[PDB]
Structures are given as structure tokens and as C-alpha cells.
Design an enzyme around this catalytic site. Sequence first.
Site, PDB file in Angstrom:
ATOM      1  N   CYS A 103       0.792  -1.213   0.000  1.00 27.94           N
ATOM      2  CA  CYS A 103       0.000   0.000   0.000  1.00 27.94           C
ATOM      3  C   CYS A 103       0.845   1.294   0.000  1.00 27.94           C
ATOM      4  O   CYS A 103       0.580   2.198  -0.779  1.00 27.94           O
ATOM      5  CB  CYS A 103      -0.947  -0.022   1.206  1.00 27.94           C
ATOM      6  SG  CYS A 103      -1.999   1.404   1.244  1.00 27.94           S
ATOM      7  N   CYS A 131      -6.757  -2.103   7.108  1.00 30.80           N
ATOM      8  CA  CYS A 131      -7.761  -1.089   6.800  1.00 30.80           C
ATOM      9  C   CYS A 131      -9.105  -1.667   6.296  1.00 30.80           C
ATOM     10  O   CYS A 131     -10.163  -1.401   6.882  1.00 30.80           O
ATOM     11  CB  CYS A 131      -7.165  -0.035   5.828  1.00 30.80           C
ATOM     12  SG  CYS A 131      -6.703  -0.596   4.106  1.00 30.80           S
TER      13      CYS A 131
END
Lengths: 364, 364
Positions: free
Chosen positions: B98, B195
Amino acid sequence: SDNSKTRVVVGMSGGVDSSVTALLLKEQGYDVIGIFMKNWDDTDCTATEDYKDVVAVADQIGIPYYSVNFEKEYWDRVFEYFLAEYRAGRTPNPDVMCNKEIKFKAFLDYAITLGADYVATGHYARVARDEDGTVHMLRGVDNGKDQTYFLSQLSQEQLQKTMFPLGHLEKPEVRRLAEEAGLSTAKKKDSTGICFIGEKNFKNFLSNYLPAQPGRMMTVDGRDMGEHAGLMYYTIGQRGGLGIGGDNAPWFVVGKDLSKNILYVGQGFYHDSLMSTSLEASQVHFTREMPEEFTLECTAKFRYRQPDSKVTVHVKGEKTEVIFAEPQRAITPGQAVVFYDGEECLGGGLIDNAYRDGQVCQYI
Amino acid sequence: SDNSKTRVVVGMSGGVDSSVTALLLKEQGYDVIGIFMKNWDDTDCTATEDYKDVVAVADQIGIPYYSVNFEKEYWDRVFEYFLAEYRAGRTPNPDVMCNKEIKFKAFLDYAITLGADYVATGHYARVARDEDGTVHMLRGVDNGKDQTYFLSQLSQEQLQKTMFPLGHLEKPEVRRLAEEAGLSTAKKKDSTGICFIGEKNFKNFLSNYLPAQPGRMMTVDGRDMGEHAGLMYYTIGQRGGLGIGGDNAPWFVVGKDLSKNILYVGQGFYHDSLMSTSLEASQVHFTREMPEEFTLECTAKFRYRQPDSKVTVHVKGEKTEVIFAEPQRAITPGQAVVFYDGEECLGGGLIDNAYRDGQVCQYI
Ligand SMILES: C[S@+](CC[C@H](N)C(=O)[O-])C[C@H]1O[C@@H](n2cnc3c(N)ncnc32)[C@H](O)[C@@H]1O
Ligand SMILES: C[S@+](CC[C@H](N)C(=O)[O-])C[C@H]1O[C@@H](n2cnc3c(N)ncnc32)[C@H](O)[C@@H]1O
Ligand SMILES: [Mg+2]
Ligand SMILES: [Mg+2]
């Protein structure tokens, strides 16, 4: 029925760590009793909803639970210490005091009256027993959550009756264990800050107990920078703070002078006033019997969130001298200095004062 | 008007770290723009209430805020990586991916179209510029929250356009700064776990995307211990787990064999199958231009929550060999190996496989 002959009293706070601590001990066949301490009276109450979680979890895993109140002891042995530190111009570590005097003294003697063999808590720490049967404290393997720093004051006699079931676990695992067990605290976020202040404003909290006496803020060359809110609202090294808008670069607290009610401020993370070469410490306590006078070459931590660093320590009963291999930033009177030998936590004290070139730093 | 000529785009997640990151940059006189990424579609929505916090904070400090959607890119460059790791029998680190592909590629190019000079995030890390102008990445001073591990894949060219305003701060300070600024996120607890899974059950989440194929659980001497739930629900070294009730002592996952769908389990934290003496790594990336082939004597981290340890690394372009000074526990294929030189984070890769005495460990 091996472990079933060992009674372990677990401190249950209502958090995920202690919930998992209890589940692991039950699963290992111990005779487990969960106990919730109410040590602070905080009514609009906080203790009420946490006790609900203790109960829900204790029922989920099928252990007995009880509730004891140490408000008096906590007030007398932790909160008065906390206040007296501020009055003296120092920065307290109430957790160190709390573990020393409450979790492993008041709570331990309490647990023993329940026929406990051990107390357990969800601290991230380990205890290892020697060939001789001497217990040593080891850092938790979770090196971010490792709580030996706060447990630095524990004696051999306390460690003999202690278990740390989370000591070989990392925080995310503790949460995975909780979720797979379907514990109601699995997703419960941990409370931040000191227990008794909780989610209330710190300045407001402290001013209920200590008179704030605003004073003058000065640079190291003596230039008045405005009014600070009271010295107990600032710590050595802090960036910004109440009335620190003071160039675009940030200001730091670089010293204090309680006797003039002065806050010293300066620019630069490495401001020369923030650097030290040695300290003195009081209340130096070790996890085992040590000589009256001895030298130690080891590492130390001066704050919870830093790696440890090389250190010579000269111990002489009432005072201890710590000499840094390398200059140290923002060494803070009142904070814990904790000594390590690789993975072993040897013990620790409370920082009295920092020194640079044989002269006390104006930290206060 | 010095810093006012420098435009900084700050990633704002709705958390206290990014809120404080934005406030500090504003206070230092930068031309600050807050940007919220929506990278995951999670409707009963999560993104909706976080964007409220971004807005409330951006308004509190008086900066512009915008909202961009990288669901596609995130899916393609992070989530497919995440799934493909599991299919291959490895354990992914989606955060590393990410940061590499989203926060500092998609988001950075996006920010540049807003005339950004720098992007900032609330990562606990530092960047130092050389005499020559070469940027190096340093650990956050908060050694529990230090995020260089997850930033190991960042290039010189990404670091040149990066700022980390929290890099010299510890988490409790970030909260004190937030509270004193009266930011509405001051008391907001940080979301745990990845997340996109958030506060939903992990097993349930993953099984929506990958077929779980329960298989056999075996001890190292071949004794069938029951059924596991699917290998992607277990990681090398984990204590207990789905159907690991298996003596009172706990069981650990000590190996995997994807080709037979086997989970290996064993008792003892230091089970001999959990120990390794070297590894190989792929996707080895450094923060600066390095030679084609070179040896490095440094330290490394093999997991986020451990201290770094001494290591010889032999790099040869496509594969890297890492030799441990001391045997290592639960070296996990798919996880990041990250290299350090004291406080500098040199770079890192993804663990392919562990070795003991010139033979691949059955980790999978
Ligand atoms: C979360 S506290 C650690 C925080 C801090 N570093 C310290 O040492 O106090 C660690 C353990 O203390 C015990 N504990 C904390 N509060 C308690 C309470 N109110 N009642 C019973 N046990 C408690 C729990 O077992 C908990 O897991
Ligand atoms: C909390 S994340 C760090 C967690 C993890 N270790 C990693 O590297 O991804 C660090 C920073 O990334 C940025 N960030 C995370 N989610 C974001 C989002 N949805 N939109 C904009 N920025 C975000 C924020 O600035 C945040 O402070
Ligand atoms: Mg707890
Ligand atoms: Mg954040």
C-alpha cells in the site's frame, strides 16, 4: 488436574489483554479467579462499564470473578506520589508506582487471601526461573508493547508469585485469540493516558488538585517569550504546548526553573540545553539481591518509547549515577531509568536530575 | 511567507496522527491541502464517518480538504497482491504494498497534479537530507510506533517528495498536541488490523474471496491432530488457532505444506521446527541506488514488533540471501525483511523461504 492444583488470580481490567490472559490460563487448566480493581472514583461510572466486560468475559470462559476496591491505597500510594512529583517540579510515572504498590503489593496480598499461588496480569513481560529457582524478568517479545519499563520496581519476592501469560505474544495475536474465542472485548479499544484521567482534559484534571500558577516563558538568552500556564503542564523536550506559539520553526521546552516559576523554551529538536551526559537516580530497585556498592555496564531506557542505550551505572545505596555512552536528549526528572542486560530487565529507579559537564541541567 | 511557497499535500485518514500532521504543517506556515483517500468500498460507509472527521479537522485548522478515490488501484495493486499471497501459501503485508504503490505512487502523482511540492503522512518515520542532497529514511523516535518497517520499499525519488511531520514525536505527544489544539479527533481511537477488514471477523472476510479448504493438522512425527480450517487462517509460529485444542501446554503452528493442505503443529514456543538460520528474499528494494551485487553487514527485522538483529546480506539482483547471527524464530514467507544501519532504514524485501542447515524449512 496438573495445573488444576495451582490457583492463579488474574487482574481483569475489562480490556482485551486481561480477557485473553484469563482465557489462556483457563485453557491451560489452571484454577483461575478473575478480579477487578476499582482504584479511582470517577462519577458523572467508568468502573461500572468495565466491570460489565469483566463479567461478560468471565462468564464466556466460565471462571469466577470478584471485585475489590483499593481507592484508598491507590490514592495514598500512587495519587499522592503523582501530586507530590508535580509539586517538586518533576514529571511522575504513576504506572511504575501503581505496579510496585498496587498490582503487586495490595492486589497480591489480596489474592493470597483467596489462596492464590500466583497473580497474573496482561502485562507484556516475561518471567524466567533459574536452575537455582531465581526469577528474572524479560522484555515482552512484542518490543512495541513491552512493559518491563513500568515493572522495573518489582522485587524477586513479587516475581516469584507472578505470571505473565501474554509475555510471548504480540498485540495483534492477543486480538486474534480474543476474536476466535468470541470474547466480547475482542474489538474493545484500549484506554489511552493514565487510568484516572481517562478521556478527560489533562489540564482541567490536574488543576482540580494543584493550583496552577502561570509564570514567565524565557529563551536561554533570557528573552521573555510570554506566559506559560503552569510548569506542571510541560515536560522537558516537548514540542509546542500551552501558549507556545512563541520564524516558522517549532519551539521546545528546554528547561524549567521552579524557583522562579520559569519555563525555558528554544528552537531545534537538538537544542544544546536538551542534551545531557549523565544523571542521578533515586529509588533504585533491582529484581534480585544486589551488592551495597557496585558498577554495572549495561543499557538503559530513560523513556518508555525509546530503544535502550549503553550506560555505566555506579550504585551506592541511596544514590545511583548513570553515565551515558552518548549524549541524551531531554532526560526528565521524575521519569524512570530502567536497566537492561540484553533481554533481561535488571531493575530501575526514578531520575533525580541530569548533568552536563559536572553541572546540573536546569530541568528542575 | 517562507514555507508559504511550499505546497504540502497531507494524507488525511480521519485519525489523530494525520490530523496532527496537518495542524503542525499549517502552524509552520506551509501551503497545506488535506486529502482523504477512499480505497475500499465497505457498505452496510466506514469512509463516510472518517471523511466527516477529516472535514471537521480541516475546518478547525482552516485548510482546504478534498477527497479522491483509488479503489481500483488499491484493488489491483494491493488487494490482488494480498489474495495472491494467500493462494501461494504465504503471509502478505498489504501495508508495505500500500505505501509503495498507493500512498507514495498513486497519491503522490495525484498530489503533484495539485501543484504539491511534498506529500505528508502521519507515519512515525523521519527523512534526513545529505550534504549531497541524498535523502535517507530514519526510524521514528517513537520506537514502538516506528513505521519504517512498512515504508521499507520507498525509493529515493519518493523520499525526495515526502515529509513526515510526526517523525520526531511519540504517540502520547501527538495526542497532547491534538487535545491542546481542540481537534475533534483528539480522543479518537486508532482502527486496528488491516484497513479493509476493519472491525469485521477475519475468517469471514477472507472466506468471501478465497475458498477455504480444510485439511489435516499433523505433528512433526506425523500424528494426525484433527482438521484445520484452511491454511490461510494460520501463520508460522502462532499459538493456538482455529481448531487448535489439539497435556495442558499450548500448541503452535510450526510449519505448513500447501501441497498436501497440511498444517504442522507442535508444543513449545521454541519448537525446533520454528528455528531458522538463513532466508531468501525477493522484491529487495533500497532507499538509494545500490550496486548490482554486494555484501552488507547490518541488522534486520523479520516482523514489525521485534527488535532488529545482526545479519549478513548477500544481494545479487533477483535474489537476496540473509544469514542470521543467531537462530530466528518463525521466519514467515511473505512477510517483510527490513534492513537497518543503526537508526537508518536501508530498505527491504519480502521473505521467500527460510533455511536451516542448507534445507528449506517446511513453512510453505
Ligand atoms: C493495561 S495494565 C498496563 C498499563 C501500564 N503500562 C501499567 O503497567 O500499569 C496491565 C494489566 O494490569 C491489570 N490491570 C489494570 N487495571 C486493572 C484493574 N482495574 N483491575 C484488575 N486488573 C487491572 C490487567 O491485568 C492488565 O492487563
Ligand atoms: C495510519 S497509516 C500507517 C499504518 C501502516 N503501518 C501503513 O504504513 O499503512 C499512516 C498515514 O497514512 C495516511 N493515510 C492512511 N489512510 C489514509 C486515507 N484513507 N486517506 C489519506 N491518507 C491516509 C495518513 O496520513 C496516516 O497518518
Ligand atoms: Mg487489559
Ligand atoms: Mg491517522
